[PDB]
Design an enzyme around this catalytic site. Structure first.
Site, PDB file in Angstrom:
ATOM      1  N   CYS A  13       0.789  -1.227   0.000  1.00 26.70           N
ATOM      2  CA  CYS A  13       0.000   0.000   0.000  1.00 26.70           C
ATOM      3  C   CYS A  13       0.825   1.282   0.000  1.00 26.70           C
ATOM      4  O   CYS A  13       1.541   1.575   0.953  1.00 26.70           O
ATOM      5  CB  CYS A  13      -0.967   0.000   1.186  1.00 26.70           C
ATOM      6  SG  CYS A  13      -2.095   1.390   0.961  1.00 26.70           S
ATOM      7  N   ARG A  57      -0.279   4.515   2.727  1.00 24.22           N
ATOM      8  CA  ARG A  57      -0.213   4.336   4.170  1.00 24.22           C
ATOM      9  C   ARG A  57       0.048   5.556   5.054  1.00 24.22           C
ATOM     10  O   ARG A  57       0.006   5.440   6.277  1.00 24.22           O
ATOM     11  CB  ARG A  57       0.731   3.188   4.524  1.00 24.22           C
ATOM     12  CG  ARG A  57       0.150   1.798   4.269  1.00 24.22           C
ATOM     13  CD  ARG A  57       1.144   0.681   4.582  1.00 24.22           C
ATOM     14  NE  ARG A  57       2.204   0.594   3.584  1.00 24.22           N
ATOM     15  CZ  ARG A  57       3.343  -0.072   3.742  1.00 24.22           C
ATOM     16  NH1 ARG A  57       3.595  -0.718   4.871  1.00 24.22           N
ATOM     17  NH2 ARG A  57       4.214  -0.133   2.750  1.00 24.22           N
ATOM     18  N   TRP A  71      -9.294   5.759  -1.242  1.00 28.05           N
ATOM     19  CA  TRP A  71      -9.511   6.516  -2.471  1.00 28.05           C
ATOM     20  C   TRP A  71      -8.465   6.121  -3.522  1.00 28.05           C
ATOM     21  O   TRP A  71      -7.464   5.484  -3.206  1.00 28.05           O
ATOM     22  CB  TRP A  71      -9.604   8.034  -2.239  1.00 28.05           C
ATOM     23  CG  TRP A  71      -8.440   8.681  -1.571  1.00 28.05           C
ATOM     24  CD1 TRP A  71      -7.282   9.093  -2.162  1.00 28.05           C
ATOM     25  CD2 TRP A  71      -8.327   9.016  -0.181  1.00 28.05           C
ATOM     26  NE1 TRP A  71      -6.454   9.660  -1.227  1.00 28.05           N
ATOM     27  CE2 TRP A  71      -7.063   9.626  -0.002  1.00 28.05           C
ATOM     28  CE3 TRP A  71      -9.166   8.860   0.935  1.00 28.05           C
ATOM     29  CZ2 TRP A  71      -6.617  10.078   1.248  1.00 28.05           C
ATOM     30  CZ3 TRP A  71      -8.721   9.311   2.182  1.00 28.05           C
ATOM     31  CH2 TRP A  71      -7.460   9.910   2.324  1.00 28.05           C
ATOM     32  N   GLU A 105      -3.865   3.634 -11.005  1.00 29.75           N
ATOM     33  CA  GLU A 105      -4.603   2.385 -10.859  1.00 29.75           C
ATOM     34  C   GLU A 105      -5.756   2.306 -11.864  1.00 29.75           C
ATOM     35  O   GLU A 105      -6.041   1.236 -12.401  1.00 29.75           O
ATOM     36  CB  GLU A 105      -5.128   2.229  -9.426  1.00 29.75           C
ATOM     37  CG  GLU A 105      -5.577   0.803  -9.046  1.00 29.75           C
ATOM     38  CD  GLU A 105      -4.433  -0.204  -8.946  1.00 29.75           C
ATOM     39  OE1 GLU A 105      -4.719  -1.413  -8.776  1.00 29.75           O
ATOM     40  OE2 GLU A 105      -3.250   0.202  -9.027  1.00 29.75           O
TER      41      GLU A 105
END
Ligand code: HEM
Ligand code: HEM
Ligand SMILES: O=[N+]([O-])c1cccc2c(Br)n[nH]c12
Ligand SMILES: O=[N+]([O-])c1cccc2c(Br)n[nH]c12
Ligand SMILES: O=[N+]([O-])c1cccc2c(Br)n[nH]c12
Ligand SMILES: O=[N+]([O-])c1cccc2c(Br)n[nH]c12
Ligand SMILES: [Zn+2]
Lengths: 414, 416
Positions: B120, B123, B292, B297
């Site tokens: 991630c 973070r 979000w 992506e």
């Protein structure tokens, strides 16, 4: 133990059985993966405090001879058992041994073939090997190097080549090329901490000056070579300008690009790595091939700690440099890579783009799966610095391990 | 010097050491022999449905580690409240075979699981996560009410807020609470007669499972799928998300007028729902979480992956680029404009979005915050570096140590 390897774009699956031949350990353990680390300290090539164990050396030696004889399909033959004995008698008596030219040629090719970070391994079989083991001075290293460069460059139709200097001997210094590449640009630490030229070469440039080089003041001054014969101070040698091919950069549609005064040399020749073949180590064995456009346009010209031209180009393109959301950086980098490809193609100099390169690597991975049952590949290095997922290698799982013969990193001679 | 992984940042030349990895009690896929760090689904965090409870003692050790972590976070390590809780957990496991988490413990574990996720990049927001306790839920119908509530709160009309909904944990002699879908919001993938796929190729199986379970399928490229919610020991039930709850963004380009005519769109809320949340040995098989989107992506992976929408060529032809030769860098030009459209469109619609440059810059800040706070930060380089313009972001030039720390979000076998 054997890794199930999957390609996520095609859904295909393969199993790497070649990793079982790896005898050298990497930095990873089950508790943590250190695959992203650039350099080692464990995988490094430590000096000779004396001859390494005869058993250890003899073991690596026998394995290499075995690999060589399988190569020519004369395995188990008389020529084979006689060669294994020659190597054993020589190690038992002298603590080291010597390779035949054909073994060295095979070894050099296998070294490249085994390099996990190289995306150009499809070309592994075509490598011109120059045996320079008949070298006793820095002066001679220079001549061999100039001849390597003349052959490799080939008027712009580049050819892969490697020059192998004398191996390391216990109780004697190493033959070393102090430069990281045969051709690199100077980095002048201009007063205010800033650097005119290539910031990655500040130290080597200072050393060249320290050894008598009268420096320039441009952004692209080709550096001289610091060649070192055993237990001798490095000697300074200026490469003949007619030997160093350079390509001035210009854009196919953006008239003002050429005005940036950018340019890059044609020959990528790594000269600071150690070539290991059958336990023997060659501290001086510069190799070269040809550039993948992204190394120049993205890494060398756009890295923050390098030339860092991203913004100058974006300002010229009149892009929104105020915010990151305008993607001014992404747009500038793409135009720079295109300028590199256009420039090299226009100058009739060999170059390969990241899309063509990675497509060929996929073919190579397929060839290798069939040939050896796997292929050591380091994902972080195989995927290009820009447009990663746009290339086939991004969606391909890879297994990274160390196979010998191998090109390894080694301590700086100073 | 130090007996820990030395980590270097090549851009800045700075060095740090990771001491946090020493606290990893779970092994990854690598061995000194070979690195398998590039593999997506390694059989490590994988959790094959254990028919019964965990070994009373194995669960006990995991439980003790979590309780210690908890009391250490509130600064009461070694206190009577700490020792009493440890006894209470052992007593509970001794008589019932499992144990239960106090509310604050669940909130702490849920935030730690995010904080511990190696892949991630977002973070830096870990501390600001809204944890919805849904451990009272007892039917697929209620799971749906809770999910709709999550979607509403999380979406917040375009001003997204991170959140996770925690449904009842796995229980001995009792089926699992499962959300069959991979995300709360996903477009359908319809397998054409000619072999092709309309919509999202990645969602072909779930789409077919929706139909096998009573869904009346449409035939568009962007048809939101219904949810297949499963309660303990029951078959899954179908639930259609009310359209007004699913915020979407029509994609348009800031200068290329024709882009809007392509009819491309993407949903605003990324909510992973098929992962298992593990805390102290307790497994929450149903615990959807959302945050979000990072523009890459959507614009790069979802829209440009060859095995996904694969729109690169269509956009290239529209930009009038030479798609017949690699050297024109037609793929690169198109992908850039596709990402600019996603950024421009979300900003235009007033929906939260973060470009890859801003996100990685913030992750570098997170890395520094965690060096001082925990002495390291588990990071998976291949997943942290953006799918485009990699070396142009500061994370590319940062070495990383990857390891598994608990609490954690783990992969789990598909319920079917
Ligand atoms: C045919 C053209 C070639 C191309 C386009 C090519 C391209 C690349 C690229 C892009 C990298 C990754 C970035 C880097 O490590 O610097 C690389 C790494 C490497 N290549 Fe190749 N390569 C070629 C030829 C060669 C040759 C002739 C050899 C050796 C005989 C070689 C040996 C290696 C090695 C050892 C590395 C790793 C260097 C390191 O660890 O820093 N390559 N190559
Ligand atoms: C706040 C905004 C967030 C952003 C921009 C962000 C971004 C990303 C990105 C780019 C990935 C990489 C692609 C992938 O692995 O699927 C990822 C992975 C992940 N994120 Fe975040 N994330 C955010 C919020 C969250 C939240 C709120 C949670 C949980 C509470 C979370 C948990 C994870 C996990 C477990 C993964 C790994 C998925 C996998 O194993 O493939 N993220 N995130
Ligand atoms: O093209 N490259 O990017 C590149 C990188 C590193 C080494 C070599 C050699 Br030797 N030929 N090309 C190379
Ligand atoms: O498919 N892969 O082999 C693969 C390797 C490493 C990272 C990623 C990501 Br992010 N998507 N696919 C990946
Ligand atoms: O933005 N993202 O790319 C992304 C990827 C994977 C999961 C999440 C979550 Br939960 N919020 N954003 C995410
Ligand atoms: O700097 N890094 O941490 C790092 C990790 C992995 C790959 C690369 C390359 Br290619 N340049 N820098 C890298
Ligand atoms: Zn690893």
């Amino acid at each position: 133990k054997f890794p199930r390897v999957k390609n996520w774009e095609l859904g295909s699956i393969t199993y790497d059985t070649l990793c079982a031949q790896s005898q050298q350990d990497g930095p990873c353990t089950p508790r943590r993966c250190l695959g992203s680390l650039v350099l080692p300290r464990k995988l490094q090539t430590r000096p000779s405090p004396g001859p390494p164990p005869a058993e250890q050396l003899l073991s690596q030696a026998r394995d290499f001879i075995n690999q060589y004889y399988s190569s020519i399909k004369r395995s188990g033959s008389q020529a084979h058992e006689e060669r294994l004995q020659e190597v054993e008698a020589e190690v038992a008596s002298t603590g080291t041994y010597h390779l035949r030219e054909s073994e060295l040629v095979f070894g050099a090719k296998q070294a490249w073939r085994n390099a996990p970070r190289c995306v150009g391994r499809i070309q592994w079989g075509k490598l011109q090997v120059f045996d320079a083991r008949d070298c006793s001075s820095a002066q001679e290293m220079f001549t061999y190097i100039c001849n390597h460069i003349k052959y490799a460059t080939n008027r712009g139709n580049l050819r892969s080549a490697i020059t192998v200097f004398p191996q390391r001997a216990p109780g004697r210094g190493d033959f070393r090329i102090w430069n990281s590449q045969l051709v690199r640009y100077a980095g002048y630490r201009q007063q205010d901490g800033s650097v005119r030229g290539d910031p990655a070469n500040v130290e080597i440039t200072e050393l060249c000056i320290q050894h008598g080089w009268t420096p320039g003041n441009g952004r692209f001054d080709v550096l001289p070579l610091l060649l070192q014969a055993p237990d001798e101070a490095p000697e300074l040698f200026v490469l003949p300008p007619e030997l160093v091919l350079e390509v001035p950069l210009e854009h196919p549609t953006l008239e003002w690009f050429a005005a940036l005064g950018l340019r890059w040399y044609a020959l990528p020749a790594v000269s600071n790595m150690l070539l290991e073949i059958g336990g023997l180590e060659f501290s001086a064995a510069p190799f070269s091939g040809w550039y993948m456009s992204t190394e120049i346009g993205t890494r060398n010209l756009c890295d923050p700690h390098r030339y860092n031209i991203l913004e100058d180009v974006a300002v010229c393109m009149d892009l929104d440099t105020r915010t990151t959301s305008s993607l001014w950086k992404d747009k500038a980098a793409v135009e720079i890579n295109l300028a590199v490809l256009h420039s090299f193609q226009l100058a009739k100099v060999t170059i390969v783009d990241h899309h063509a390169a990675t497509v060929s690597f996929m073919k190579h991975l397929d060839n290798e799966q069939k040939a050896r049952g796997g292929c050591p590949a380091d994902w972080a290095w195989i995927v290009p610095p820009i447009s990663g997922s746009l290339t086939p290698v991004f969606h391909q799982e890879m297994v990274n391990y160390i196979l010998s013969p191998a090109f390894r990193y080694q301590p700086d001679p100073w």
